[PDB]
Symmetry: C4
Subunit: 332 residues, 4 copies
């Protein structure tokens, strides 16, 4: 049967930290932490399809992002500045001259949760209240995340939010995928004809450039390591992939594959930000993960070159809705 359960493993911020398991009748078990509404593991016949830390306890010892619901804004904001009309709002500069990842972001907070299931799905709904002014963002914000598993081995991620003030909001699920192997060795096809080259600060500075003729061309199936180990100046600059790709609208958004498994990625986001875990090195808390072991498909609106953030602006009471679907299937 489709079923759910959870176990409490710790306390943080006067709240319980739990590990929630969703199971189906098709060989899949999904593990979620209410800490950061974090996707911890995706087990297909016992094999983990994503990067995970050594233990659930490890996730809250420091900020390592993997699996997390990162907000209020995932990625960078130039000079931490948001201009609307003749007004500019200043966000905290936690990334040198810029702002990144919401400051002390939502991936670091303990969310409330509620598991449920029916004849078609096993799911967990998570909620978080973030007060007006937290990390200098305007608006009381209510966030709702759902991870929902069906019998077709599709894991659906839904992230909804509402603010009571004009604000900016562009969160992302920060899961790294490896299909039980290493992302460097995996094949990728992606329906994106353009990417955003970035500057030394890691932000776009000239809008879209064609992927054609560059390391970023995944229009035809290509080994990820071919891009990572190329002499491409943008790859060298960011020590691997660390780049927004602008989707062309054809389905699926991305298809990641090994000889044994395939992952089909779909989303209502306009972009995928691909980061190949360029900084991992088998040390510290994350000693079980090395460089290029996993790759994100961060489904969000792309980071912007400057203070025009119209795309990610929410009116008071406007419903934000992000969907991502990760479908796991058998290889060729």
């Amino acid at each position: 049967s489709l079923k759910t359960n959870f176990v409490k493993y710790e306390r943080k911020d006067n709240k319980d930290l739990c590990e929630i398991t969703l199971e189906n009748d098709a060989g899949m078990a999904v593990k979620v932490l209410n800490y950061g509404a974090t996707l911890e593991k995706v087990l297909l016949d016992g094999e983990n399809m994503i990067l995970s830390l050594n233990s659930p306890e490890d996730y809250s010892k420091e900020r390592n992002f993997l699996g997390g619901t990162v907000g209020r804004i995932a990625g960078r904001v130039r000079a931490g500045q948001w201009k609307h009309g003749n007004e500019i709002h200043q966000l905290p500069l936690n990334d040198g001259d810029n702002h990144i990842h919401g400051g002390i972001g939502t991936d670091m907070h303990v969310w409330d949760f509620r598991p449920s299931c029916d004849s078609e799905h096993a799911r967990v709904d998570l909620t978080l209240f973030d007060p007006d002014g937290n990390n200098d963002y305007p608006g009381n914000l209510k966030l709702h995340a759902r991870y929902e598993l069906d019998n077709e081995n599709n894991l659906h991620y839904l992230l909804e939010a509402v603010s009571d003030k004009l604000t900016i909001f562009n969160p992302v699920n920060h899961t790294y995928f490896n299909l039980g192997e290493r992302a460097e060795d995996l094949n990728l096809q992606m329906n994106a004809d353009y990417y955003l080259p970035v500057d030394e600060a890691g932000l776009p500075d000239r809008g879209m450039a064609e992927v054609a003729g560059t390391a970023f061309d995944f229009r035809k199936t290509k080994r990820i390591g071919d891009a990572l180990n190329s002499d491409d100046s943008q790859i060298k600059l960011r020590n691997g992939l660390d780049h927004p790709f602008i989707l062309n609208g054809n389905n699926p958004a991305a298809l990641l594959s090994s000889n044994k498994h395939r992952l089909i990625v779909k989303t209502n986001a306009p972009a995928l930000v691909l980061y190949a875990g360029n900084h991992f090195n088998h040390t510290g808390i994350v000693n079980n993960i090395g460089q290029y072991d996993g790759i994100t498909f961060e489904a969000q609106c792309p980071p912007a070159e400057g203070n025009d953030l119209g795309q990610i602006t929410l009116l008071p009471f406007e419903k934000f809705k992000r969907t991502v679907d990760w479908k796991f299937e058998e290889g060729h």
Copy 2:
């Protein structure tokens, strides 16, 4: 036919007090009072499945909770305090050092009502306006309760609300179930692996504890009286069950049974607070009910240990929606 009617029996607060009857074609009659949007009786072939007072008039003579729509917050709030950001709001201390049951709560107000029916349901919709600042709660609040009976002997309870200010809201239906017998003698199975132990003040103080190895273990069908008459320190502390149970997500939330009847409880709440009518003693207005005659399944977000009430916070204009389904069927 599915049908409705009502009778006026009294006046209170310059309004009429009525008793509304919903009937189906499957042997069920449900009686509702617009006073407190209160579930008065659930008759299955003439046999009452819930605790009821001697007469409808008795419900409004004093606060005895049974059947009532208790709000704005059912249960306790530590120190009556709600912290959001750097702001704390103080609620009335009607429970010693703490706040309980909304002060002069919604179970004590006269709601407006409207019966209706169709080929599938007989229902009554009830509404209440609670002004900003009543019982020191922020926000004008509009509440809508519905009791809806179908031909499958399911009684659906829907409780919706909206506030025009940032506020806190966690109401509950306070029906006590007995299946025409005494709850102490009934069997219970409940899909909850954790409960919240409470302190001397009746509030949680350490988050979840496993039900395994305690009186609170209803994972396998167990006579309620076995828990009530056990030497468990938490049972002794609260003179019986008076505890939040955190649901594991598997269906149903609870199954209460006698040899003759079963009640299947489903809800979109994350918790059930179980209270076994520990204080009843066949005296006063409630002289027809004794200790442990009935048990609640209060479907709400759980009472919290402190002033972090994020789970029950509503933005202005945010729709709150609680569902409970009580399905009555024949025994084994």
Copy 3:
């Protein structure tokens, strides 16, 4: 075919006054005025089922109510006063010591309109903006009325509204029905066990009274004239029927019949206010209508005895929705 059209006949308030015709394939033609979103005629095989003035031009010469969308509040408000919390708002005293019919109400304004049709319906949607403070009511208000005709000779009336401020709103469609004859001679059955007796000022003063044993008993089919010509003190007081009836929830709300036609009335309102055109006398602008020629079924929340108007209070941005269905069929 289901079809619509309109003709312009006059100018008022720098706007065009039009008469809109909805037609079906089942012998029905419905005439609507954008002046007051007014139901002008309901023609079944050429025979008018409702009271109408001599000409469309007559409707805007003075306030005669028939067919009109009367708001913001249809009927009386005691002392013109609305109490919410510790605040009381004062409405204009256009009814002696009381307020009635919204002051210079929405039945006196020129609405915008748009006809449309499809394979199932012919309809006209009408809209009106009423500014904050008009007739001393709070809130900018957007009203939307729809008259929609199908091939089953059902005319659906939908009235929706939203305010940007906490406010009170209880409009009604003021159509008088006669089935091409005189209402005094028609039979009526109504699923209401209670009515609200009124005082000398025409307002309720003691809540519900049983219809049983009074002129107001239409639980079993009865000639309307039997009530009108009875010695009942409430009938004498109001010179006929002028009374709220509280619906019991069984279907339909009312059934009005002659030997040739029947009208089946359904509504999502809790009450019908019945007024038998007690003041008409074949004089003035309305010289074609005499006493008791038609009867309203004003589907609204009932007039209240005092300043507690919780039932009709709207939060800012709360959607009000009233439906009425008038189905015309062949007699027995």
Copy 4:
């Protein structure tokens, strides 16, 4: 397959200008610019059905309107004044004594965009944030435009918006149609019995006039050039058609035809404003288009004679929704 793609061709306002192509399996390709959410081309078996500039780059060199999403208000506002209650708001006088086309309107802004497709549709969703006070309009505004192509050669246009302040909003899609020929030579049938004659300033001054007996009568199929070359005083005044037509509600709103093609126009707007490109003259940036080469069917609420703009007033948080459907089919 239904498919989408886009190409970047320029930069403007620190954003990329792209040309988005939607294609189906029925011979249609639609080209959209994110600059002004502009409909650039509609190709049916290689033949363009609408007016287009020489190149996508031409659209942003100056304001020429064709294809554009023109807002916040398309068309004129008398004296630039909006009266609500006792308040009047003043808009910029960019049209002599009047206001027109939103000032520096939304057809001149770079919108964000996202293509997508499925088994039934190929679409592009575009969004724009317009700050409070831009062009002296109140309210932060979020606009969403969608162009959606199906396999029946219907192109659907959806335009939605929400403001956080009481405001006025009446945008339009400004596509000119020619069916690969010249509009002057095309036949038109239109289900509108009334038009709004205009004054020297191009605004209505007397409400509706019958089309019967005038050049504006398209109730029966008529060559557009017959109206354009007539001696009608309103045609002479505006150098061709430049007039609101008020729809009668029968389907379709308009049918434009050549010997080879037909265009079926449907809309939820109450009016179509018809402008026959009266000013084009094969000079300047638009040197490829001459007088009467194309005709708009601007689906909006009609321009008003004065400061009563109730029809186009939006409450804060009220959802505006315009639909237009353009279906292209084979001729007779």
